[PDB]
Coordinates of C-alpha atoms and ligand atoms in Angstrom, one line a residue:
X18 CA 27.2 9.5 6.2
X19 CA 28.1 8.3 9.6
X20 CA 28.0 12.1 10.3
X21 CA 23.7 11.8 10.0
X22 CA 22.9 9.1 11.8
X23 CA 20.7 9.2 14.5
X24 CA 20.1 12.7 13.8
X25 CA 15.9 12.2 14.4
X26 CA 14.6 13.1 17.5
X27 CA 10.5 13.6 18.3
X28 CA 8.1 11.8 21.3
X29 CA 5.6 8.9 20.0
X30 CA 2.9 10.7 17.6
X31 CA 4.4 13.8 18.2
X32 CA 6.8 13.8 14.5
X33 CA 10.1 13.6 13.6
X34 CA 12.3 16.3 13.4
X35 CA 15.8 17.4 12.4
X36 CA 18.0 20.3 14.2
X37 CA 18.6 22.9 11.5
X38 CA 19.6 26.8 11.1
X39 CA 18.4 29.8 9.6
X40 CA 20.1 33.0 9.3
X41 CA 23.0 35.2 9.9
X42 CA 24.5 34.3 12.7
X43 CA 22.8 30.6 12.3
X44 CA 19.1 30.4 14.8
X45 CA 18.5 26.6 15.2
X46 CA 15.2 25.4 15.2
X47 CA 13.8 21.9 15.5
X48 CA 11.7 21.2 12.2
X49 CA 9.7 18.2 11.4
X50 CA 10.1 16.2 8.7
X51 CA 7.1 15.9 6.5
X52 CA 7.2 14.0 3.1
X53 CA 3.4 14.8 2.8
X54 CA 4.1 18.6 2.0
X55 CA 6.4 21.1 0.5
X56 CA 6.6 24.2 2.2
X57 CA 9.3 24.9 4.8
X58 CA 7.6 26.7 7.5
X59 CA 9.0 27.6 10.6
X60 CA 7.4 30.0 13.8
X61 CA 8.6 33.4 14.1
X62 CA 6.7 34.4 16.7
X63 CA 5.9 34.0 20.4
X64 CA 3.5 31.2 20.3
X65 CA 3.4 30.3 24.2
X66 CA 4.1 26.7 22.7
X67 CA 7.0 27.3 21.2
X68 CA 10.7 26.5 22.8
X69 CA 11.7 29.2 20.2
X70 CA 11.2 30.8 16.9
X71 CA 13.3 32.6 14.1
X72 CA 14.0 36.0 14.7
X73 CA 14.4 37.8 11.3
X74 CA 15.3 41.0 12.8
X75 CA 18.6 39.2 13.7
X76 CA 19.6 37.8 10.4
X77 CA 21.4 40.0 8.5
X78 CA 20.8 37.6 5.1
X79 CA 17.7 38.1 5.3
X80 CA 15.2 38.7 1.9
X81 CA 11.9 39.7 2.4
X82 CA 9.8 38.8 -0.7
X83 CA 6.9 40.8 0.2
X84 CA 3.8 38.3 0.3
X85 CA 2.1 36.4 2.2
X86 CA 0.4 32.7 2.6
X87 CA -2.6 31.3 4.2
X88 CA -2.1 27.9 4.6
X89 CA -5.2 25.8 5.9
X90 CA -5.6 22.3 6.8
X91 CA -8.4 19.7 7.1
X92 CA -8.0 21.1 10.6
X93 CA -5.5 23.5 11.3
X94 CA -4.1 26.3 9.5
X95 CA -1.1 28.7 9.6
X96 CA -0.3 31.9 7.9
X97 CA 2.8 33.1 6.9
X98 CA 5.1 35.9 5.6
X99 CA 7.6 34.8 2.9
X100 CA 10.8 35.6 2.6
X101 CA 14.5 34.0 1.9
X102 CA 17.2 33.5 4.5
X103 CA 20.8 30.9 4.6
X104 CA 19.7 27.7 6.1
X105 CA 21.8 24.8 6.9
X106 CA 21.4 21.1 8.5
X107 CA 24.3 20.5 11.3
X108 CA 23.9 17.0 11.3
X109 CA 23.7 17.0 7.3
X110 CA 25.7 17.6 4.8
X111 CA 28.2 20.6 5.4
X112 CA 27.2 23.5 3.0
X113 CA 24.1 25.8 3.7
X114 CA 21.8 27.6 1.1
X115 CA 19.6 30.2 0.3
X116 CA 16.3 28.7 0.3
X117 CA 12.5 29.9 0.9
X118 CA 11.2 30.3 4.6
X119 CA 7.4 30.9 5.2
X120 CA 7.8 32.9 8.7
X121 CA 4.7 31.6 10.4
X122 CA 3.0 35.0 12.5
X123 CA -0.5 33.1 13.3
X124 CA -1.4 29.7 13.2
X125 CA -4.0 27.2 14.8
X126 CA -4.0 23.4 16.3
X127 CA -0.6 23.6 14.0
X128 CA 1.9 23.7 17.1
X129 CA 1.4 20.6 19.1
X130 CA 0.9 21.8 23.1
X131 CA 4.7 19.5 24.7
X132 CA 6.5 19.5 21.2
X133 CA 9.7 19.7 20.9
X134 CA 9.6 21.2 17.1
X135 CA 9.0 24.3 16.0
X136 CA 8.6 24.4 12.3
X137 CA 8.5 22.0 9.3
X138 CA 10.2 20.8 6.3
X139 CA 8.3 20.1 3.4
X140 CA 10.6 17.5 1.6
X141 CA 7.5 17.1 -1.7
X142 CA 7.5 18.8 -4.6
X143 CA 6.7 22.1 -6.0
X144 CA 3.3 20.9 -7.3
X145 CA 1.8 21.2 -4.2
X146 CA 4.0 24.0 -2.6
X147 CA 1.5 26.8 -1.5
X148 CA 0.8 29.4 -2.2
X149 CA 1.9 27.7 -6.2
X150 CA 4.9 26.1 -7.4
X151 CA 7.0 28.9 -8.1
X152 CA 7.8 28.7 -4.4
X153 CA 11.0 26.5 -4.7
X154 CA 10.5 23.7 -1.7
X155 CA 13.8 23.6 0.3
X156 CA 15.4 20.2 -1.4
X157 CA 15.0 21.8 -4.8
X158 CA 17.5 24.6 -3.5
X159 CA 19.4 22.2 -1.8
X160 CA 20.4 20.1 -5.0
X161 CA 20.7 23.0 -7.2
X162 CA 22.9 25.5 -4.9
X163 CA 25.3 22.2 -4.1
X164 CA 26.3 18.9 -5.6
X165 CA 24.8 17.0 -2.7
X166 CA 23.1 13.7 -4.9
X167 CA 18.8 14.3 -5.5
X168 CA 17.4 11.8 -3.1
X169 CA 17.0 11.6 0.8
X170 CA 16.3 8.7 2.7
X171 CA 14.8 8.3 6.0
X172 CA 14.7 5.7 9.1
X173 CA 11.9 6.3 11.4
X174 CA 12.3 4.6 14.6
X175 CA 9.0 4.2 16.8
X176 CA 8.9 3.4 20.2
X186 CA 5.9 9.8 26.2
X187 CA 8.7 7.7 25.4
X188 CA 11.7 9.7 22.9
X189 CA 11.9 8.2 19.0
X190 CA 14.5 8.9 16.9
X191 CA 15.7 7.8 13.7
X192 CA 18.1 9.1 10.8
X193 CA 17.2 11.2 7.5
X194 CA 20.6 10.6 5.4
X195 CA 20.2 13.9 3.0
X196 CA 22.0 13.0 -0.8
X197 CA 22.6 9.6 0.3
X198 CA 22.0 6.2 1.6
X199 CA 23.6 4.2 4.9
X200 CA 23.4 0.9 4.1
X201 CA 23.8 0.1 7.6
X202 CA 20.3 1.1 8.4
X203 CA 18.5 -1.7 6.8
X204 CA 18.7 -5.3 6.7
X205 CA 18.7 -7.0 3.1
X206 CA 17.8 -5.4 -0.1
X207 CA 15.9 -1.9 -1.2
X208 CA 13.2 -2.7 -3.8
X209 CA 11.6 0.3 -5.4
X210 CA 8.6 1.1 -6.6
X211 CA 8.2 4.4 -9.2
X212 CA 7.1 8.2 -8.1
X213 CA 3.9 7.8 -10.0
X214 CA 3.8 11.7 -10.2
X215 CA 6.1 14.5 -9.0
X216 CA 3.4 16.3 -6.6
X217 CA 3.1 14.1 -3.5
X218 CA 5.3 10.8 -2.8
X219 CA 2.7 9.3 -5.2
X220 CA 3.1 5.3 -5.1
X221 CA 0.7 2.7 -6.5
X222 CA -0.6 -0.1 -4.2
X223 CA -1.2 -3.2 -6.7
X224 CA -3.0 -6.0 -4.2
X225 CA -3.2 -5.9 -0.4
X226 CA -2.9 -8.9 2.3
X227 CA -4.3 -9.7 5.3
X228 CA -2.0 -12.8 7.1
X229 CA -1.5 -13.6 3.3
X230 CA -5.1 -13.7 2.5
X231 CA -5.9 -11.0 -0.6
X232 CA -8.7 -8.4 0.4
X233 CA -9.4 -9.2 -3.7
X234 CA -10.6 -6.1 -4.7
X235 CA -10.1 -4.2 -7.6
X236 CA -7.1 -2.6 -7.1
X237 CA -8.4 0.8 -8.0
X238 CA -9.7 1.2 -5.0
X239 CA -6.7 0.7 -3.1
X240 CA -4.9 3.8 -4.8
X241 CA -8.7 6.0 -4.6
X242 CA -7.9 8.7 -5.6
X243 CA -4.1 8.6 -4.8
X244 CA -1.4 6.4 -2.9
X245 CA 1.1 8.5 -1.0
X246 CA 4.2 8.2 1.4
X247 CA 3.7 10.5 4.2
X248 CA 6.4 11.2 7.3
X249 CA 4.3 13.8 8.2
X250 CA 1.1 11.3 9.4
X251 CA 0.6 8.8 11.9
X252 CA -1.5 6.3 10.7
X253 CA -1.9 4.1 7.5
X254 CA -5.0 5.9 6.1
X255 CA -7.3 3.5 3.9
X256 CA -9.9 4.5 1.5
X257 CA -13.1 4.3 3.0
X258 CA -13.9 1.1 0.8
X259 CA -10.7 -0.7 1.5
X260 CA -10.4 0.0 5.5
X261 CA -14.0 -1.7 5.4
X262 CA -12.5 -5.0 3.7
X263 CA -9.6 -4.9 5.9
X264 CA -11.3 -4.3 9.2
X265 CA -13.2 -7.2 8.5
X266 CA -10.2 -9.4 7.7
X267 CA -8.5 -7.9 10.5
X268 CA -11.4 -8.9 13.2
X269 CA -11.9 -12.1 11.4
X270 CA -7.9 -13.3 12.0
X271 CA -8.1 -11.7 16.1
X272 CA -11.7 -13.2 16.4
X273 CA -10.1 -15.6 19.5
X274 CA -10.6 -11.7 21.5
X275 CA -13.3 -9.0 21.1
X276 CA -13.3 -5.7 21.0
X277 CA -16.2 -3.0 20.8
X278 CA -16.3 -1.8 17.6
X279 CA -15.3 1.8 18.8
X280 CA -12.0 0.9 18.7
X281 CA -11.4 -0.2 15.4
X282 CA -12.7 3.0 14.4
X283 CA -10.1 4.7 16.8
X284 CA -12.9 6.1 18.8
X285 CA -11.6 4.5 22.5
X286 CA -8.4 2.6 23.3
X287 CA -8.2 -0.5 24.1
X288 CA -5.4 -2.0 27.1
X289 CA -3.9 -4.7 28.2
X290 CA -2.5 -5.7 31.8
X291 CA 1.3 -4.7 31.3
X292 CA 3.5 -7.2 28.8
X293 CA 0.4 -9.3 27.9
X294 CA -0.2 -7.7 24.3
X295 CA -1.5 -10.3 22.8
X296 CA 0.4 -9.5 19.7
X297 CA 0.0 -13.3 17.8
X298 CA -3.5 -12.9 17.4
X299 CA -3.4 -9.8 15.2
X300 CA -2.2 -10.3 11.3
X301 CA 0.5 -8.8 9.4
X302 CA -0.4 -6.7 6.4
X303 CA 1.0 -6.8 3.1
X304 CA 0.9 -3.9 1.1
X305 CA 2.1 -4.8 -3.0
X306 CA 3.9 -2.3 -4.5
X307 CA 4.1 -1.7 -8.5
X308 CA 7.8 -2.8 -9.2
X309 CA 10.5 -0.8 -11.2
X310 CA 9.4 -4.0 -14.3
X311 CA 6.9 -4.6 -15.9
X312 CA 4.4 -7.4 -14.1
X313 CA 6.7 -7.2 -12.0
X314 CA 6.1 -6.0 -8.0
X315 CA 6.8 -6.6 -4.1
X316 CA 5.3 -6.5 -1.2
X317 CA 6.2 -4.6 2.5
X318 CA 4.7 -6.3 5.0
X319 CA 4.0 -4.6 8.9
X320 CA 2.8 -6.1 12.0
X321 CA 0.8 -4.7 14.8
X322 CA 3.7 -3.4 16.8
X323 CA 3.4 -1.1 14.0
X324 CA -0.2 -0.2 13.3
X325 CA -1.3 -0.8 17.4
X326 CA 0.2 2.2 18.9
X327 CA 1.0 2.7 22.5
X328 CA -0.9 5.8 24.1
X329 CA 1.3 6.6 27.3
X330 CA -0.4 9.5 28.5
X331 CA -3.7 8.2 29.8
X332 CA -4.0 9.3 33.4
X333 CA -6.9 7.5 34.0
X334 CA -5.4 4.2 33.2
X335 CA -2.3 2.0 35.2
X336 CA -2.3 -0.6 31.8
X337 CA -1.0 -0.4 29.0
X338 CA -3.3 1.2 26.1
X339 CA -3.1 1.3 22.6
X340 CA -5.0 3.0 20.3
X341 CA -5.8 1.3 16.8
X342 CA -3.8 3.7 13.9
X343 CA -5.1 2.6 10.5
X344 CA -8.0 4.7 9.8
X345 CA -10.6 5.4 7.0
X346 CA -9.5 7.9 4.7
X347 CA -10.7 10.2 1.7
X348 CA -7.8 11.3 0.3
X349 CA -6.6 7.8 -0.6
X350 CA -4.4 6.0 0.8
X351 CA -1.9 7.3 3.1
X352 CA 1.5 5.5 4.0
X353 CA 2.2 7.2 7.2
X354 CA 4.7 6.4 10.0
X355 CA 2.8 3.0 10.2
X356 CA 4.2 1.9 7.5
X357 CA 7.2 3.8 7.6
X358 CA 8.7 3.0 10.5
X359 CA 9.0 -0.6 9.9
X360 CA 11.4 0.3 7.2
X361 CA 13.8 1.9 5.5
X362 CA 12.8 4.5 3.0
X363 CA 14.8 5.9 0.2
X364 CA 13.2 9.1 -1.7
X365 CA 15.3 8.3 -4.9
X366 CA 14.1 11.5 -6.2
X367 CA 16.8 11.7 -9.6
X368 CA 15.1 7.8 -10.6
X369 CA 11.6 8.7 -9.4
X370 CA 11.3 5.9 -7.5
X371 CA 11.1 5.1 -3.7
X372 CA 12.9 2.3 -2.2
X373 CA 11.7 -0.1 0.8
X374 CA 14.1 -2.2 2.8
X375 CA 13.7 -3.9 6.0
X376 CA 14.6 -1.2 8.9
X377 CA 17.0 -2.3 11.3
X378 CA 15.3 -0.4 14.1
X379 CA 11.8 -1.5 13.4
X380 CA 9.8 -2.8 16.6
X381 CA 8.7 -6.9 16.2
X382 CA 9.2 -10.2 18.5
X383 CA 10.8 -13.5 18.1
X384 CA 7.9 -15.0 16.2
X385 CA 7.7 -12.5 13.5
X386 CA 9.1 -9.3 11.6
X387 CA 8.3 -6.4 9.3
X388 CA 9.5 -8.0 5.7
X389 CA 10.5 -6.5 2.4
X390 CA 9.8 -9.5 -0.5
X391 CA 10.0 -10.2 -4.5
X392 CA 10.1 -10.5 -7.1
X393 CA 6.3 -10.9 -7.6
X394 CA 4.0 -11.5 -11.0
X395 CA 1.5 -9.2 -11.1
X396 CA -0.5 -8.2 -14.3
X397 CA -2.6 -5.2 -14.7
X398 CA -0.9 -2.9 -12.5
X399 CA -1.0 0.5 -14.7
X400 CA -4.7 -0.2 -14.2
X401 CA -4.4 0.4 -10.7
X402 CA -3.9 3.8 -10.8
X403 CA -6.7 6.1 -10.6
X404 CA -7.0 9.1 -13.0
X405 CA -10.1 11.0 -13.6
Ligands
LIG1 C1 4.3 9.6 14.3 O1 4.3 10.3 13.2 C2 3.9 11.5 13.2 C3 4.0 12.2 12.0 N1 3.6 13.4 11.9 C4 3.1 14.1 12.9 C5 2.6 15.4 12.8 O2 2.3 16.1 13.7 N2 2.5 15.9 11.5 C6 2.0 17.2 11.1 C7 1.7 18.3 11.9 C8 1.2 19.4 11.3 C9 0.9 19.5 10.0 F1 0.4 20.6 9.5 C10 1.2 18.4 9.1 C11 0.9 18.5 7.6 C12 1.5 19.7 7.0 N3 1.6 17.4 7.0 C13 1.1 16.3 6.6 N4 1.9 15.3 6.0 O3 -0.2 16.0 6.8 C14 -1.2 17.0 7.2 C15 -1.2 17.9 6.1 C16 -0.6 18.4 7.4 C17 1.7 17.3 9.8 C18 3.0 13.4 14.1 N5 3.3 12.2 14.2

């Protein structure tokens, strides 16, 4: 899959996105790639934001399907007219489909203002496909149009300075990661939906009953920035977190990502913030493992602040009420395979992940771990 790699581009909290084309002759489009959805959505009209847009009255394989979708967001929304078109990744495997294509004609605070992307890939199931699940999500006509394998996997490479990464569609480059993939089961086809069994603070347990840590769902998510907590389990971990960096201060408005905080240029004082260990139910029964990230990972570097000459960071795990959300925090400290024909998603340690001499993102088991089923939350 040499053919794939490095084929990731974006800016730092800006996404990730893959070249790809739709139509007859091809239009390519940069599209994010967003695990935390299923729709693929690109613009198709003159948004002053946009470096471009798909032009249906050029392709002459276009299908116009004759309904619409309004498609809001916690904040944000688009709307959309669906239809059907060829698409095809370059850097991807060599074959191109038919697949759905929501052509965005109004949309708010969904285009980011300096973006280099103008659309998205929704790589999650049909569950939560909008406007229902009869709307086949683009990998689902991928694998049945082709013989390219059911699963994707994706290296997101962090650190407005240019990221980049690899998503290896229908396979897996071992040369991505260092040591072994461990997987932990797609609780539920919907969402990436994981189970979180016990979490760690510099090895130190937050102890709570692991319910909460999955309240009301655990997900993977390319398509966020931070590691989102439940609203219970950010407090336990904040205070752990301020506890082990107690040797410095820091107004409280910055752990709740209300101000950044900076420091005079290369004197992060990285050693005094913990690692964090996130347990994972394991493909065995009582059996788990545990990712661990560092704060290169979840203390993010803000570049554009004009009003600053240090460098400033701004703190990216965050209280949540959707449960817990393993954004490109956790992700890009490893290597993720969406082993979507085993319903199961695999963590190894990523070869491009940011860390020091003293210490490094870590993939580890197996563990004992009793009880897990309980952790799940059902209504
Ligand atoms: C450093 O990492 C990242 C990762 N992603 C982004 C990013 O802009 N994502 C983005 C933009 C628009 C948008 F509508 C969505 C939706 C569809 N997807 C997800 N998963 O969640 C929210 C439901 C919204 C996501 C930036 N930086």
């Amino acid at each position: 899959f040499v053919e794939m790699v490095d084929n990731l581009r974006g800016k730092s909290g800006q996404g990730y996105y893959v070249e790809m084309t739709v139509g007859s002759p091809p239009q390519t489009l940069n599209i994010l790639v967003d695990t935390g959805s299923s729709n693929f959505a690109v613009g198709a009209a003159p948004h002053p934001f946009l470096h471009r847009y798909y032009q249906r009255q050029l392709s002459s394989t276009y299908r116009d399907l004759r309904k619409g979708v309004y498609v809001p967001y916690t904040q944000g929304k688009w709307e959309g007219e669906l239809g059907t078109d060829l698409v095809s990744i370059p850097h991807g495997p060599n074959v191109t489909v038919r697949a759905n294509i929501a052509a965005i004609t109004e949309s708010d605070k969904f285009f980011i203002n300096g973006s280099n992307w103008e659309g998205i890939l929704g790589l999650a199931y049909a569950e939560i496909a909008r406007p229902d699940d009869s709307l086949e999500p683009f990998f689902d006509s991928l694998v049945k149009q082709t013989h390219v394998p059911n699963l994707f996997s994706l290296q997101l490479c962090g650190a407005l300075a240019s990221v980049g990464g690899s998503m290896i569609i229908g396979g897996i480059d071992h040369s991505l990661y260092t040591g072994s993939l461990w997987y932990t089961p797609i609780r539920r086809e919907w969402y990436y939906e994981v189970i979180i069994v016990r979490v760690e603070i510099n090895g130190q347990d937050l102890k709570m009953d692991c319910k909460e840590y999955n309240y009301d769902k655990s997900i993977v998510d390319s398509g966020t920035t931070n590691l989102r907590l439940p609203k219970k389990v950010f407090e336990a971990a904040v205070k752990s977190i301020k506890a082990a960096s107690s040797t410095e201060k820091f107004p409280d408005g910055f752990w709740l990502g209300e101000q950044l905080v900076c420091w005079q240029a290369g004197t992060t004082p990285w050693n005094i913030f913990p690692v964090i260990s996130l347990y994972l139910m394991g493909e065995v029964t009582n059996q788990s493992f545990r990712i661990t990230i560092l704060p290169q990972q979840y203390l993010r570097p803000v570049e554009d602040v004009a009003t600053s000459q240090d460098d400033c960071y701004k703190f990216a795990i965050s209280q949540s009420s959707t449960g817990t959300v393993m954004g490109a925090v956790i992700m890009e400290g490893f290597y993720v395979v969406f082993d979507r024909a085993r319903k199961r998603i695999g963590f190894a340690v990523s070869a491009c992940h940011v860390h020091d001499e003293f210490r490094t993102a870590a993939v580890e088991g197996p563990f004992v771990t009793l009880d897990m089923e309980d952790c799940g939350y059902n209504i």
